[PDB]
Design a protein around this ligand. Structure first.
Ligand SMILES: *Cc1c(COP(=O)(O)O)cnc(C)c1O
Ligand SMILES: *Cc1c(COP(=O)(O)O)cnc(C)c1O
Ligand SMILES: *Cc1c(COP(=O)(O)O)cnc(C)c1O
Ligand SMILES: *Cc1c(COP(=O)(O)O)cnc(C)c1O
Lengths: 443, 446, 448, 442
């Protein structure tokens, strides 16, 4: 009877499925969105929903923000596109300057635009190789960096990102990302840091010369990996190791940047780290396609054209949408709001944890959380069946939420989400856990 | 100098600042053009100078700048939904578009679509799908090709050494073959001789180290864009197509530059007889310069992967999809395919007549409103004359006409397909004047 | 100083010969320890061009399991050479190569039908394991280990993990290779048991498969059942069984490198026989196979060895008939002299001797021994386990100056691999020299 | 009858085929060799043959040469092996010094030993990369460089060297080797050279930066490709190109060195070319496993240990066999004999070609030839069926010969082959051409 409510959607999707490749979408629900605003979504059948996904953190300023809508409309009347690969336009020039300056740290930076976070990570590999003269790249297990052949190789969060499409880009080595939940009994944060740093070093102590490694790319908090934040001390060791060996230290801020964590950049959750290179995307232009690689000037001067460029990257309408997006973040104080509401949301989920033992771990840094569900607190066996039931319930009760790794609830609403609506959604999740416990949810 | 800094005062100041912040590898520089607004084939810079656009942002503006139908599609969609990722959910403009692209692609076999943001990423998808469907690893692409700037597409490319230097190793198991050149040919060669010679070169890796039975795909621009506006001969293309079918290698085309009416047919591959690709990449003009791309392939090939093998968060953005639907409406309603064909025939005649008076013009190549005017120091040696081409385009810019080069010495002719005959004639006279000026030593580049 | 001059006086012809060779022979082709120029040798005794003799505790890196210039091997070589020095098996056939390929198929571990292909080197047999694994499974990925040594051809060198100088300056290396950590039972976390070590290392093994590396696209795991160059480090039984079962569950071929540890070095014929009921899909053999004449083999289950057509894997001089004759002789010697049992017996005795040394010499942090095959790991402190390469270099230098040839692994580990024939009297003389060396180093008597 | 004469060999082979991988041999005949000497082979059934293959040019000094036999036996009694990867021995030291000096050109060289020509070509890749700091390698279609992952990637002579075993080594590019037989109507050698040099430049003009190319590896004459020699002018153009762009120029002398061509090194067939790197093998130790990479000293200093070394490489027995092999070449004048006997053989095969038009091209440099058989002299269509019948006939008449590329007879006897035996084998091949002409062979 939920299917009675999704009649136009179901019929649209059945036809879409005949034309649109199945590898292009991770399927959860029959949700065909007609319009949206803020944290509210409306489907083609008229159902309304609170967005706790923000399109995978691409909608930090909320849907259809009036400043961004106007920026897009106004720019499109003047110039829809001229490629910055050849020429110049004012929105692109203002934005590239602004990005260089608001990027973390005070060393002089330069920028190159792309369309996607994926291509910004391809760029990280190019610039690191060119600047250093070295070929090897280190990235993490559990990472997500995108879907172009460079970024895809770096990634480690899906087997379907490797199957059937190899050989991948050569000279990439994956190391394990610090997991602070499934630890050895008794380990402190210090023990975890040292153990993962020990694993980090083992390739460098065997087959991988540190002196031929161009860069380490790391998510300061892993997004698709499950909302997992590296310990402070682990990050400082990696940082120092890179500096000591002449390896560039690169970050991926595509998911966790632009105020998601309650600082501007996820890397600001750590003390005094300035990356050599960083990728930005997702929220940058409120979901219009735009990305950037930002790096220390000298690194960004290591390539000649046309080593890294795209016809529609730095599109003027996208750039205008991004200038408006950044202004909203600043004017509406969304970095601070993320920190405030994240602290609140954490406390709420931790209280839910006391009553709902299926909740193994609550990870939250700003309005940005992973709620991990396990069958048992000692074995920490993932309970994906429970998580699916929770999200299916939420969906049927007007709350859009998805999972990471099968058993982790992904919590990334628009940073603008009104308290009232955040509380409504949180109550719906409480109800969902209760309902699942009483076996009342049927897939 | 006083005169150019007079016309370009504000542009030069803005560019000097931009250069402190924007990486040099991100732009191929020709001239101090900062565009404020534009419409149809008219560009206006921030100083108020007006230009006729003979580049269409590298054939991304087939429908002309700020086409009202597209601008309205963008504003109206933006008010409803700027974005929700089709990597998780669904929206109507994207569903309408994906079905439409599946149907308008060349040939009658059932197709499916996957969106990206760039022609680059659609070429990476071609590798991924061809490898998954065939279970083979090797990819064959062309010298002189341009497929993009992601690690897959950039490996397949062959038009700039700066696309390989300092950044390898590149994607493994890619082999480059030479693209047929019908200008610098051996004495006495016919088109048949050229086709057979290039085909013989195509075969040599397959007769040596490259197993045809382990080759997933051959990727070809039916006409090379960045390579110089070079069209493969009919017979050569038929030979490769047949070779692919006989060995179970997917035959893939890149229509990112040459598609959507550029050549005077909807797809450049329709310049050849009865060829239906297994896979094809689309981009550039698809959404009037808004970032959108697609990989389109035979159904059974597109079913060979599971999620999330190929997807991007902002690909199939609803605003871009709305723009593309509007763009495809314009092409049809305004008969732009036919207009490119008629104006193409006309432009080729005008440039052939210019070649009679201006022997620096070695070769006039044109298929639709889509030409390469190749300049040379001597008609018999055919030695490239890049200095002359640079002077021509600099003269042109100073006289209100935006045009750039391919390979140093080839004038690139790709106006918006909507270009009014009156502006096309103005721009052609400017070029004619340009050739005269360079001939008389009246152009000196600072 | 006076002493150094004295030593160098006994090496006068050798030093002069080496100085000239250094003008023509590339530095990357040798890891230098001593001015040792061998004139002749027999058994475990080496004789240099200056007339000094030495007890061999290296056996040319376990290539001389049957001892030097074994009469039977010399005779095989000489008699074969008279008949046919070479005809390549890449085209034609000869009886010594036919006899030997059949014998190797049969003496390989396990009772599944096998086939063989010859190489010249342990390196090229490991390239072959990549080739055959990829071809049989239709999968591209190869998993090997940190700390491994598999050779110096581009495939085998990529799989390796024991020297940075095997990657520096020569990449890109062979693609689709992933390296995993090998179980270290010495430097462990406080209070870990062998069971804890086995689970922790297997957990690490699984991480790539749980991340970026599809098990269903992994052609093979290649493992040394005991790592040689990595330090004489044996995988725990439980770890090995986990990896073996994982491979079979996912259709990944399980391959072993026996080039160093095979042919009776561990006191079983094959080092994988140190484990319960494990039969490899593929294995590489080398080193001692032909008493140091260049020969190798890849040995695999029949259906794996049938996955390729000619000439996917062949070398003009592999399966040379003089090398083959040497190898048939060498295998006879192993059998007829009972060297597998002698390795085990002498290995047990040497282990006790080194354990008793360790009671008196706390610089000995770990004594690892499986057969006449040991790593004696020297450390600055028993609790920190910090490596003491300086102490180790001093020990082997003292040994060399006192008639015993022994080298190190990883800087700080004494490599103990004498020819398996070594007479007890000699084995005992060598052991006393090492005991003496420890004492000398403790008392500051050795200067490098 | 033919199978009657090979009773024991056939049963032996059936048995060996159960145990020895099929990928390890290219099968031609049921030939199981018992003993051999000079250019004479004797099988296990007692049949004798004249060797026109020399084990793929590994037996330049003839089988079981007394000097090599004695060197092997004398050295085995002293020391069978001690690895030069750690220590030293005199035969190895004398040989590395000697090879450094007899290699082509006057610049100071250094040497590193391997076991196989394959491993020496892997080393060319290593050293070129390490010395130049560049990654790309250029090699040729039609080439054969070996069966290790490096050398096998460089190779271009067999599809079964690529199938099923990829990905291969990355950053390798293949270019077409000049074909002087199947040319465009009217082409001169100058035209051939310039056209092939044009194709050589195409990758460097498109995707492959000459400034990131570490080396070009070339067979001065391609062996397995069909006995095909690059024109002089083409080689000079490549050589100059390499020097102008800082690319190492490397040669593979594994098949064509050690006197095979009638000069010591095949590259000496060209004017004043000194390679930066070169691979040596095959005949080096009379078929005992030994190889070398020889390069200009500064190139060979670019790597540290243990970047390239093998346990059994530079084995002292193989080393002694090599020293003796090199002495034979000098003391029996085998470089000149290959030149003189090669001129003689070329004239005989050219005279055969006048009477046997199935003979499309006669290529010969030294005692080293490719006799290419075609269905028609104008079309040049390959006739692998005629070549198969020729070599089968030969085998049945006491002459061992094989093919390259299906239709090219491979003519590489030991350089010592006595004139009586060379005339006898030439007449057998002339009879074979007749038999095949008359439809007498199946
Ligand atoms: C989403 C994401 C990307 C990829 O961005 P796309 O725009 O989908 O190409 C890269 N990195 C991280 C951490 C991400 O979450
Ligand atoms: C422009 C172009 C591409 C790449 O498109 P981007 O949108 O710049 O990634 C691909 N192929 C051809 C033929 C092109 O001209
Ligand atoms: C020595 C060794 C090899 C290499 O053998 P070479 O003959 O030197 O190529 C391979 N594997 C292991 C375990 C070794 O010890
Ligand atoms: C035979 C050959 C090789 C390989 O030598 P192996 O000893 O078989 O590895 C290399 N190059 C050439 C030109 C050859 O003829």
């Amino acid at each position: 009877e939920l299917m009675g409510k999704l009649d136009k959607a179901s019929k649209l999707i059945d036809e879409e499925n005949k034309y649109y490749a199945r590898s292009a979408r991770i399927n959860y629900y029959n949700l065909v969105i007609d319009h949206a605003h803020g944290a509210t979504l409306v489907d083609v059948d008229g159902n309304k929903y609170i967005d706790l996904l923000a399109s995978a953190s691409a909608i930090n300023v909320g849907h259809t923000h009036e400043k961004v809508v106007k920026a897009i409309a106004d720019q499109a009347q003047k110039l829809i596109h001229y490629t910055p690969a050849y020429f110049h336009h004012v929105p692109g020039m203002e934005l590239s300057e602004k990005l260089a300056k608001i990027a973390p740290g005070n060393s002089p930076k330069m920028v190159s635009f792309g369309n996607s976070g994926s291509d910004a990570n391809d760029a990280i590999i190019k610039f690191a190789r060119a600047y250093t003269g070295r070929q090897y790249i280190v990235s993490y297990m559990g990472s997500y960096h995108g879907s172009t052949y460079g970024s895809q190789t770096l990634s480690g969060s899906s087997l379907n990102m490797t199957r059937k499409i190899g050989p991948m880009l050569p000279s990439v080595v994956h190391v394990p990302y610090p997991d602070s939940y499934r630890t050895y009994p008794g380990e402190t944060e210090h023990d975890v840091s040292l153990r993962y740093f020990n694993e980090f070093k083992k390739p460098f102590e065997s087959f991988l010369p540190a002196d031929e490694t161009a860069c380490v790319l790391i998510e300061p908090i892993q997004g698709d990996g499950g909302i997992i934040k590296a310990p402070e001390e682990y990050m400082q060791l990696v940082y120092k190791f890179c500096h000591e060996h002449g390896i560039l230290f690169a970050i991926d801020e595509v998911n966790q940047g632009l105020g998601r964590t309650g600082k501007m950049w996820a890397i600001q959750q750590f003390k005094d780290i300035e990356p050599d290179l960083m990728s930005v995307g997702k929220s940058l232009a409120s979901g219009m396609p735009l990305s950037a690689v930002i790096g220390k000037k000298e690194v960004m001067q290591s390539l000649d054209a046309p080593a890294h460029l795209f016809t529609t990257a730095g599109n003027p309408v996208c750039s205008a949408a991004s200038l408006a997006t950044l202004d909203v973040i600043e004017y509406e104080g969304l970095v601070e709001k993320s920190a405030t509401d994240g602290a609140y949301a954490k406390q709420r989920f931790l209280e839910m944890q006391q009553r709902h033992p299926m909740i193994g771990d609550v990870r939250m840094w700003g309005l940005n959380g992973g709620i991990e569900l396990v069958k048992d607190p000692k074995t920490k066996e993932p309970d994906s069946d429970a998580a699916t039931k929770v999200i299916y319930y939420a969906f049927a009760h007007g709350v859009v939420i998805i999972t990471l790794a099968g058993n982790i609830l992904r919590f990334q609403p628009p940073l603008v989400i009104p308290r009232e609506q955040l509380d409504q959604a949180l109550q719906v999740l409480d109800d969902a856990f209760t309902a699942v416990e009483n076996g009342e949810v049927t897939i």
